[PDB]
């Protein structure tokens, strides 16, 4: 019922179609604890696109880290999702991706970037709703964010992703 329609409306409200996405994560302290406790290690973000009919993507974050960054870092990953127009798109996904943790003093943003590994299952045409997430396990030391600084303000953080559109 209205629950499924409300859900669709929510996704539409967050979608962008220019490869630029800003994900505001509220209730930081709580979600942060849920991660540290091991109850909810990760969180997926709403979907966004490279163009009106481009690739469908989303972000995946671990407030207390994943893999090599477990317990010491904020881990941030990129996710290629099964899009409505994947049949018209070139595969594997090969666009540069830039990830950022925004400094709310607008000073020192945490930034990193990578170009896809064309041979990884993470960038092949999706068979499932989401491909394996790929990105930065050591994106940012917990001490750098969470702790203090201007990354966490009014119990929220902002993550930004920029997908280069060269060739698209």
């Amino acid at each position: 019922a209205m629950a499924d329609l409300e859900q669709k409306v929510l996704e539409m409200e967050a979608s962008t179609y220019d490869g630029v996405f800003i994900w505001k994560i509220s209730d930081f302290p709580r979600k942060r604890q849920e991660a540290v406790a091991g109850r909810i290690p990760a969180i997926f973000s709403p979907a966004f696109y490279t163009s009106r009919y481009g690739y469908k993507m989303c972000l995946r974050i671990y407030l207390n880290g994943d893999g090599t960054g477990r317990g010491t870092h904020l881990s941030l990953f990129f996710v290629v999702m099964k899009g409505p127009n994947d049949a018209l798109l070139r595969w594997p996904f090969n666009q540069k991706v830039t990830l950022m943790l925004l400094d709310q003093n607008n000073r020192e943003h945490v930034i990193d970037a990578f170009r896809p590994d064309v041979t990884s299952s993470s960038f092949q045409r999706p068979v499932n709703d989401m491909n394996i997430a790929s990105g930065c396990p050591l994106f940012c030391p917990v001490s750098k964010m969470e702790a203090k600084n201007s990354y966490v303000r009014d119990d929220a953080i902002f993550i930004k992703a920029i997908v280069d559109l060269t060739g698209l």
Binding site: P41, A42, F78, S120, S122, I132, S134, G135
Partner: peptide
């Protein structure tokens, strides 16, 4: 890029 471990 490196893949996540539990997805």
């Amino acid at each position: 890029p490196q893949q996540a471990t539990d997805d």
